[PDB]
Design an enzyme around this catalytic site. Structure first.
Site, short mmCIF file in Angstrom:
data_model
loop_
_atom_site.label_atom_id
_atom_site.label_comp_id
_atom_site.label_asym_id
_atom_site.label_seq_id
_atom_site.Cartn_x
_atom_site.Cartn_y
_atom_site.Cartn_z
N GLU F 4 8.29 3.72 5.50
CA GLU F 4 8.44 5.08 4.99
C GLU F 4 7.43 5.35 3.87
O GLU F 4 7.77 5.56 2.71
CB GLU F 4 9.90 5.31 4.55
CG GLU F 4 10.34 6.74 4.42
CD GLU F 4 11.82 6.84 4.12
OE1 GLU F 4 12.47 5.78 4.00
OE2 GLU F 4 12.34 7.96 4.03
N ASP F 5 6.15 5.27 4.27
CA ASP F 5 4.97 5.50 3.43
C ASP F 5 4.91 4.55 2.23
O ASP F 5 5.02 4.96 1.08
CB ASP F 5 4.89 6.96 2.98
CG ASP F 5 4.45 7.87 4.10
OD1 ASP F 5 3.68 7.41 4.96
OD2 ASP F 5 4.86 9.05 4.12
N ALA F 6 4.77 3.27 2.52
CA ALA F 6 4.21 2.31 1.58
C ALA F 6 2.98 1.68 2.22
O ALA F 6 2.54 2.11 3.29
CB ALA F 6 5.24 1.26 1.16
N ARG F 189 3.08 12.67 12.44
CA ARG F 189 2.52 13.62 11.50
C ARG F 189 1.29 14.28 12.07
O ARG F 189 0.73 15.17 11.43
CB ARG F 189 2.12 12.89 10.20
CG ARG F 189 3.26 12.22 9.48
CD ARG F 189 2.76 11.50 8.25
NE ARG F 189 3.79 10.70 7.62
CZ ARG F 189 4.63 11.16 6.70
NH1 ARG F 189 4.57 12.42 6.31
NH2 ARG F 189 5.54 10.35 6.18
#
Ligand code: MG
Ligand code: ZN
Ligand code: ZN
Lengths: 44, 56, 257, 65, 151, 293, 76, 94
Positions: F4-6, F189
């Site tokens: 989750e966006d690291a 995305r």
């Protein structure tokens, strides 16, 4: 008392009580120069 | 006669405050325990003295 | 167990090791990076810095200079590294570019391996003076103590039957990149001593006509250093650590029981 | 900002082979053969020779402690 | 625990604050811990549950064709907390090598008397579910070996 | 760790030079003139004077009141020692203020959470007649956890952890990657320009010439995947990769390229603060606002 | 004036009376780890030494808190 | 390298090994596997920022041999196998 060096090279060791100018350049702005002591920075 | 979740969290809260102000403890000793955790172990064996009042 | 030295060059080597297995290969690989010790500058005392760069940046580059490490004078397979300290001094004044070759060493056996490294450029009248202290360390604590690299791959054989259209394209391709080719009337066998990008026409034939079979127990190793340890003295030292490391275990195990 | 003396992924020195590199690219020779002629093998060594700024000339001349 | 907070990890800010007095501290532990809030009061369904990798990893474990070898079973049962002794048994397909199936590594986490049957999102052929369902509804407990390998 | 966006940056790649960034501030202490005629002179403060900040914080000043450069100023250390003039000797007379008659210490000091070393001390005169000294202090700031990175496509994130070079999934060449991006964010995305740029770094690093990539007239899609296919690699980036913990080919072909990232200044040492019991409001006895107060 | 002191979206019913600024807190950034249990949390070691609980030594933690006060406010 | 035992039962031993890492542990794991009397050998490093130097080992036998003996004989082999390979290397660069 000090030994301050101004912009556009020159030395001008005076004091600090009355006025702060450079006689040779005619400007008035001063950096305080680094001393000649020994410090210790680690390399990481 | 089972307690609810609001009464079980008040009986522990009042007993953990007596156990810090004196109020000699039952067999609960070992080696170091925060006073809140002493109230949880006394409540596990079902030896709480404090009883509720049921308004009706 | 056997070895086949493909090539020996200054600061590089490639070889094929047979008769070993998958767990052992990583243990040999990981030990070379994190166990073998080298010398590196660890702290620098500044007297003056009139250069264009910050104190930390000049101090940072000094640590990244590879220093020769004479293996015949201490112990490289010990678990507790020796603390012997070497002093590296410098006193220069501009104008001119400062090179690694100007550094003075208090011990003639520990010097920078490569003398053509630029440290900092100096303008008119700017002075730079410092003292560098070097000590032994391992790569696991700080990246500066790295002796080099290791990379390994499987050993495979690609079988191309002559029923595959345009099999000649693989013959010219494999020979251009230096892969050995053994030809017979039934098919051809390409030994993959390096990566072999399959050209697009043959993707649909991977599995039907063209198949790859792994040769159990054979690995191609690649080792390259920077000049701190003699390129074929790396693997010998790393092997002697494994021995020493898995001997301490026996002492501790018996004491428990 | 002078060239980094290591790479950032592959530990291998590079700062000795930059000022010999750039004096042979301002003659018109293609860099695809100049970097191959030296000892640069992968493309993790090569992304940090082929893109750099060496801006140390401008900052140095200003002269202030 | 990152659908209750509605957070993500692109540099957000979370603030904690310690409670002090001994009455205000035992109210926090009994009434407000995480495991009391696993289902939600808006729709009943669970809220603290699996996210991005936990789903698409769990599909790769239970695919038809997920055969793990002996070293990979023994390594992952030590990594996922659990403590079981030497019973990964019985090496179901020894045809290549003595290696397990993907279902029985997943069937060590469940309690010993579950019984559930339901249909999920991957159903592209409703007829081959039907047949399985039909047997189940009439013969409540069939044998797990014979008929069930029509799955 | 990279969910989750690291993102998971290398350790030995930090420790050789990636994104080592510096931070500056400056301070503007001066010398004012009141309208009465009394001008405040700056010097070394004596122990007596009212409003003393403390002691053994003045170990770095020189005689006249200026820090000589390159000294590890840290915490709440002073920068310039300022003496102020009496300021109403006869206003209150609160049973002891008649006899003391001294001075009230005011000064400037670094903001009380930072660190670093001084760089250059200025001393001059400003317009009217006075004097003002400017001091600037720098910092070193290695990229630890928290430090927000981002692309120029919009894939922002935070350093997940800092895994050593040895435990890195590496490839059938001398390649050891740095930033292992989460695969669950690209086909969610719609950022296909990430994947064209990642091949375009690998073609334009082996060929030698920096690929033009401008909008609407740039380098086309098909010419990259043929120049990659004739330089010695597969047409889609995918390569054989070995894990570093155990060591066996991952039974997939892991994608790999060169993406230009950029570090951002939402670094963690400008966000983290804790407050136990601090100075409060005078009117309400409630805490203040901002870290500067 | 008084009517602006009583009211005004930050006055003295919501701004300062029923909502106040607090003590014993912290605020920083977040970063994942799937190795701790579901109901745990990381705490940095700088924030852990600038927030305190009161403990009220009774009889059975007296050996613990003799060591916690002998050790100074430096070692964790 | 100090062995910190945790669980001890009948035919089972769990313990911590400070100062070691993936490098030795993985080599020691599959070497143990070759021994038919070791029913179950494994390890874990828990959360490699707070601790990454003390793997937790677990060894289970069939009762015909003690867990310590299994460890003993499995760290013999690695020393002997390296001693072989080393000789090969030396006698090959000539
Ligand atoms: Mg956010
Ligand atoms: Zn002048
Ligand atoms: Zn590189």
């Amino acid at each position: 008392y000090r030994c301050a060096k101004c912009g556009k090279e020159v030395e001008l060791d005076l004091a600090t009580a009355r006025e702060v100018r450079c006689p040779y350049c005619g400007s008035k702005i001063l950096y305080k120069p680094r001393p000649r002591v020994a410090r210790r920075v680690k390399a990481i | 006669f089972r307690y609810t979740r609001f009464e079980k969290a008040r009986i522990i809260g009042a007993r953990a405050l007596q156990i810090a102000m004196g109020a000699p403890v039952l067999i609960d000793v070992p080696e170091g325990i925060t006073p809140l955790q002493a109230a949880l172990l006394e409540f596990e064996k079902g030896v709480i003295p404090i009883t509720v009042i049921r308004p009706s | 167990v056997e070895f086949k030295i493909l090539e020996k060059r200054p600061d590089s080597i490639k070889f094929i090791v047979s008769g070993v297995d998958v767990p052992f290969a990583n243990a040999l690989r990981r030990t070379i990076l994190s166990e073998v010790p080298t010398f590196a500058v660890d702290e620098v005392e500044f007297l003056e810095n009139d250069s264009a760069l910050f104190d930390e940046i000049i101090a940072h580059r000094l640590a990244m200079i590879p220093l020769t490490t004479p293996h015949e004078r201490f112990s490289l397979d010990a678990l507790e590294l020796d603390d012997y300290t070497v002093t590296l001094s410098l006193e220069a004044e501009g104008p001119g570019m400062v090179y690694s070759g100007d550094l003075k060493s208090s011990d003639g056996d520990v010097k920078p391996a490569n003398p053509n490294i630029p440290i900092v450029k100096l303008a008119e009248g700017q002075r730079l003076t410092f003292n560098a202290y070097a000590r032994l360390g391992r790569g696991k604590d700080h990246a500066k103590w790295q002796p080099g690299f290791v990379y390994y791959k499987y050993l495979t054989k690609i079988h191309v039957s002559k029923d595959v259209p345009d099999w000649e394209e693989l013959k010219e391709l494999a020979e251009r990149r230096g892969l050995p080719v053994e030809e017979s009337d039934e098919e051809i066998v390409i030994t993959t001593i390096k990566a072999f990008y399959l050209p697009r026409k043959f993707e649909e034939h991977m599995g039907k006509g063209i198949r790859e079979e792994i040769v159990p127990g054979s690995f191609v190793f690649t080792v390259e250093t920077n000049g701190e340890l003699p390129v074929e003295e790396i693997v010998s030292i790393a092997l002697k650590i494994l021995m020493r490391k898995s001997d301490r275990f026996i002492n501790e195990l018996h004491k428990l029981a | 900002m002078i060239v980094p003396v290591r790479c950032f992924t592959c530990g291998k020195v590079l700062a000795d082979k930059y000022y010999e590199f750039k004096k042979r690219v301002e003659a018109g020779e293609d860099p695809g053969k100049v970097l191959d002629d030296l000892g640069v093998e992968r493309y993790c060594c090569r992304r940090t020779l082929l893109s750099h700024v060496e801006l140390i000339d401008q900052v140095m001349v200003y002269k202030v402690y | 625990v990152c659908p209750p907070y509605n957070a993500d990890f692109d540099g957000d800010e979370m603030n904690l604050h310690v409670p002090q007095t001994e009455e205000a501290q035992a109210e926090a532990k009994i009434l407000m811990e995480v495991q009391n809030h696993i289902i939600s009061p808006r729709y009943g369904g669970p809220l603290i549950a699996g996210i991005q990798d936990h789903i698409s990893g769990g599909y790769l474990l239970t695919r038809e064709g997920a055969y793990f070898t002996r070293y990979e079973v023994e390594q992952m049962l030590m990594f996922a907390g659990m403590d079981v002794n030497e019973l990964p048994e019985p090496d179901k397909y020894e045809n290549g090598e003595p290696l397990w199936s993907g279902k029985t590594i997943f069937s060590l986490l469940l309690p010993d008397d579950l019984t559930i049957w339901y249909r999920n999102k991957l159903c592209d052929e409703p007829e081959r579910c039907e047949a399985l369902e039909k047997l189940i509804e009439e013969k409540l407990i069939p044998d797990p070996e014979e008929v069930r390998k029509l799955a | 760790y990279n969910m989750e966006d690291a993102v998971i940056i290398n350790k030995a790649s930090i420790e050789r030079g990636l994104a080592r960034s510096t931070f500056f501030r400056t301070y503007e202490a001066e010398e004012k003139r009141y309208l009465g005629g009394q001008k405040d002179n700056f010097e070394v403060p004596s122990p007596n004077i009212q409003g003393y900040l403390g002691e053994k914080y003045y170990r770095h000043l020189d005689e006249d009141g200026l820090i000589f450069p390159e000294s590890k100023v840290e915490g709440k250390d002073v920068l310039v020692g300022r003496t102020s003039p009496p300021r109403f000797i006869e206003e209150q007379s609160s049973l002891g203020s008649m006899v003391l008659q001294g001075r009230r210490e005011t000064s400037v000091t670094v903001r009380p959470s930072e660190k670093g070393v001084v760089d250059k001390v200025i001393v001059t005169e400003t317009g009217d007649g006075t004097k003002l000294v400017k001091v600037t202090v720098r910092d070193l700031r290695i990229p630890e956890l928290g430090d927000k990175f981002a692309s120029r496509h919009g894939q922002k994130g935070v350093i997940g952890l800092i895994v050593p070079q040895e435990d890195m999934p590496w490839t059938e060449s001398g390649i050891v990657p740095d930033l292992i991006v989460n695969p669950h964010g690209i086909p969610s995305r719609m950022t296909v320009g990430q994947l064209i740029e990642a091949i375009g770094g690998k073609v334009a690093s082996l060929t030698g010439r920096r690929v033009d990539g401008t909008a609407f007239i740039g380098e086309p899609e098909e010419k990259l995947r043929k120049e990659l296919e004739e330089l010695g690699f597969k047409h889609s980036g995918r390569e054989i990769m070995y894990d570093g913990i155990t060591g066996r080919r991952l039974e997939a072909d892991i994608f790999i390229g060169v993406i230009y990232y950029q570090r951002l200044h939402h670094m963690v040492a400008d966000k983290m603060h804790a407050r136990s019991r601090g100075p409060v409001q005078v009117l309400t006895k409630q805490p203040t606002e901002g870290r500067a107060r | 004036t008084l009517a602006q002191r009583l009211k005004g979206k930050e006055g003295r019913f919501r701004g300062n009376l029923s909502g106040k600024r607090v003590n014993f807190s912290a605020r920083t950034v977040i970063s994942p780890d799937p190795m701790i249990s579901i109901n745990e949390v990381g705490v940095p070691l700088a924030v852990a030494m600038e927030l305190t609980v009161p403990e009220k030594v009774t009889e059975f933690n007296y050996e613990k808190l003799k060591q916690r006060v002998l050790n100074g406010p430096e070692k964790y | 390298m100090r062995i910190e035992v945790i669980r001890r039962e009948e035919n089972l031993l769990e313990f911590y090994l400070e100062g070691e890492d993936h490098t030795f542990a993985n080599l020691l794991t599959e070497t143990l596997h070759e021994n038919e009397h070791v029913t179950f050998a494994g390890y874990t490093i828990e959360h490699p920022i707070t601790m990454a130097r003390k793997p937790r080992f677990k060894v289970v036998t069939d009762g015909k041999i003690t867990p310590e003996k299994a460890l003993e004989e499995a760290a013999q082999k690695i020393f002997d196998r390296a001693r072989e390979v080393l000789e090969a290397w030396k006698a090959a660069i000539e």
